[PDB]
Structure formats: C-alpha cells, structure tokens
Chain A
Amino acid sequence: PTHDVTTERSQRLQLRFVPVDREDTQYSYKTRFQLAVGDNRVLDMASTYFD
C-alpha cells in the first residue's frame, strides 16, 4: 500500500526520554519521567524497555 500508511511528517522511530528526576536510596532506585505521545502518533507499550 502507498496511501495513508506513513506519516512522512518528520517524526522519530525511537525516542529516548531522560528521567525528569531521580532519587536513589541504598535499597531502591526510583526514576520519574514524562513521556509525550506526539499529537497524532500512537504507541503500544510492548516497546519502552528500561535501559
């Protein structure tokens, strides 16, 4: 198919979100980050592995 299948409007395939903030006690490591799902793009969270 060649119609209405690809955005061709300059969006990334892989997105790396640095944590908004991070704290690290001597027992656990906690990170918080805000991920923004574009304006029209959609993802399933089978992706988004923690690196």
Chain B
Amino acid sequence: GDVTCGVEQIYWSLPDMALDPVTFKASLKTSNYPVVGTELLPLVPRSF
C-alpha cells in the first residue's frame, strides 16, 4: 500500500534559456512546454 496513490514525477520545464531537447516542440498549452529535466515527486511514504 503506497498511500501516495503511486509516486509520480515532475517534468521540470523552462522555455527560455534551455534549448529544446531532442524531438520536443513548444506547443500552445501553458503546461505542454519542452521538458528541461525531471525528478521524483517529493511524496516519500515512510512506514511506521
């Protein structure tokens, strides 16, 4: 049982300085920007 409903990841995105990585395009959606990096969502289920 992972109470976090499944650990996810956050797509760090930054349109200006970082060049668009391979096979990404800048779309209209304010969320669908090119992804510069990714990391785990800080939802660590600690067991007691």
Contacts and interface: CB of A to CB of B under 8 A. Distances in A.
Contact between chain A and chain B defined by CB under 8 Å: yes
Interface in A1-28: 21, 23
A21 B32 CA distance: 14
Contacts of B28: 21, 23, 30, 32
Main SS at interface, chain B: loop
Interface residues of B, number: 2
Contacts of B29: 23
B31 to A, nearest CB: 11
B34 to A, nearest CB: 15
A26 to B, nearest CB: 13
Nearest to A32: B28
A30 B30 CA distance: 11
B47 to A, nearest CB: 42
Interface of A: 21, 23, 30, 32
